[PDB]
Amino acid sequence: TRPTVRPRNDVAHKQLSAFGEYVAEILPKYVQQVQVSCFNELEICIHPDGVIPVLTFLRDHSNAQFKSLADLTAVDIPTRQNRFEIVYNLLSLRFNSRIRVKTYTDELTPIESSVPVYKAANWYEREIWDMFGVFFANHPDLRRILTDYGFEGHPFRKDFPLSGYVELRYDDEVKRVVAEPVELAQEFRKFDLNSPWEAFPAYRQPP
């Protein structure tokens, strides 16, 4: 085949598609959309009420057995009404397969903690709360994990500035480290890099 072109795997594509329909048939109450990517990754998009039921089924069902929570993160998309996309990446050692489960939320809508299903989720959900400000209901110990104590804001939101709002220095008069509004000797230089010509016709959107 073409030496520079990634080869397609049509068997895995068909297997993942069939299992995606399988999941959607069993949990119609929650599954909103199922898709398989051209590089063979299965995504299950669900209503946020289905977090615990869907994850529990995927972990415990005999034909699923997704015992490992590889990763749990969020994505901020300000143009959406529910700006926060919550992404669960699961691994099945029994069937040597991965699956992605996605749901959504806004700044004020809690999501149910998945710690009951995966104890791995404990710190991942603290990170989502810290970095995105998404609240997780019934989390055993929800608090910041990566930011400074007393830090204000959620810095992975698309509208949080790259350099933040405050900066630190040691002040000799008060004999301690103090926080002050950020000033930069050199402002970060924004580059406009996007070409004005379309690159990928296959992804064109209706006018």
Partner 1 sequence: ASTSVKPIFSRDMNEAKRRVRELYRAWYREVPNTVHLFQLDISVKQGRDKVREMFKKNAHITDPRVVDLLVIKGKMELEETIKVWKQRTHVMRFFHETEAPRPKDFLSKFYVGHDP
Partner 2 sequence: LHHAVIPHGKGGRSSVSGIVATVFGATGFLGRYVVNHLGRMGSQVIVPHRCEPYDTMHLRPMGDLGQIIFMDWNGRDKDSIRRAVEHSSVVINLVGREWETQNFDFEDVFVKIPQAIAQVSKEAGVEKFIHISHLNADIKSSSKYLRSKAVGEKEVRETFPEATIIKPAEIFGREDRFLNYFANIRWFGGVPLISLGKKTVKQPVYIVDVTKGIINAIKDPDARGKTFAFVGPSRYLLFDLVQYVFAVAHRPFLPYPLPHFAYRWIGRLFEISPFEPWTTRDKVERIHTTDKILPHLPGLEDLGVEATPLELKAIEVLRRHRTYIEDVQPAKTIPTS
Partner 3 sequence: TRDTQLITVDEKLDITTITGVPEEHIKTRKARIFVPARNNMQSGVNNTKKWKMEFDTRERWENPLMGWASTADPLSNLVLTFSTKEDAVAFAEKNGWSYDVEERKVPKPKSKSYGANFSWNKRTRVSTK
Considering only residues 43 to 62 of the shown chain, the ones binding partner 3 according to CB under 8 A are 49
Supply 133's token pair: 């400000």
Of partner 2, partner 3, partner 1, none, which one sits near residue 6, judging by CB under 5 to 8 A according to partner kind?
A: none
Q: The tokens of 122 are what?
A: 């404990």
CB 52 within 8 A of CB 29: no
Residues numbered 153 to 192 that lie near partner 2 (CB under 8 A) are 169-173, 175, 180-181, 183-185
Q: How far apart are CA 99 and CA 87, in angstroms?
A: 10
Q: What is the DSSP string of 143-156?
A: --SSSPTT--S-TT
- Chain centre to alpha carbon of residue 101: 10
Alpha-carbon distance of 189 to 166, in angstroms, equals 19
Residues between 64 and 123 with contacts to partner 1, criterion CB under 8 A: 108-110
Number of chain residues interacting with partner 1 (CB under 8 A):
19
CB of 181 to partner 2, least distance (A): 7
Residues in touch with partner 1 (CB under 8 A): 108-110, 135, 137, 143-144, 148-150, 171, 173-174, 176-181
Binding site for partner 2 (CB under 8 A): 169-173, 175, 180-181, 183-185
